[PDB]
Amino acid sequence: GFKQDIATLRGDLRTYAQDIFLAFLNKYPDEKRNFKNYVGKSDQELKSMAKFGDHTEKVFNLMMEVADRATDCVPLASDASTLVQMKQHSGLTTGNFEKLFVALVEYMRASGQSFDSQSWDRFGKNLVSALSSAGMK
């Protein structure tokens, strides 16, 4: 289930962070307006850059902390606030997060593996809700 998924993901965190961020960017090419220094690069080109692995691994680490602190796939309001208030997330809206979670769930459903994809879908929706409540447009 969800808790075991966090353990699976943490077990190979950089690899998964890469696979999932790429799934996101490839599903929603307009989303790359937020990531101007990854424009014009194929998946393997991105993976070859130490900065890409480093960024994706730090993002996924916080994502897993938030997931692990959630109750019944409902994240803490304080963690939502953190994500809203981060300087890095200034211009974002909840739709940016919705899209990330749609890509993440799709990635899980297509993997050979027993992820609890329905739990991740409900976590994404609840995270979107919490972001809105914490002041994201």
Ligand X SMILES: COc1ccc(O)c(OC)c1
CB of 133 to ligand X, least distance (A): 20
* Of 60 and 115, CB closest to ligand X: 60
* Of 43 and 99, CB closest to ligand HEM: 99
85 among the known binding-site residues? no
137 among the known binding-site residues? no
* Of 49 and 62, CB closest to ligand HEM: 62
Q: Tell me how far apart the alpha carbons of residues 133 and 55 are, in angstroms, rounded to a whole number.
A: 27
Q: Which does 32 bind (CB under 5 to 8 A by kind): ligand HEM, ligand X, none?
A: none
Q: Which window, 2-10, 42-50, 56-64, 68-76, contacts ligand X (CB under 6 A)?
A: 56-64
CB of 80 to ligand HEM, least distance (A): 9
Residue 83 interacting with ligand X (CB under 6 A)? no
Q: Which of 41, 7, 16, 37 is nearest to 111 (CA)?
A: 16
Amino acid identity for residue 76 in this structure = L
* Residue linked to tokens 């899209």: 99
Binding positions for ligand HEM, rule: CB under 6 A: 31, 34-35, 55, 58-59, 62-63, 66, 83, 88-89, 92, 96-97, 100
* Residue linked to tokens 């959630």: 70
Q: Which residues share a beta bridge with 71? A: 74
Q: How far is CA 47 from CA 11, 18, 30, 55, in A?
A: 19, 7, 20, 11
Q: Is the Cβ–Cβ distance between 106 and 19 less than 8 Å?
A: no
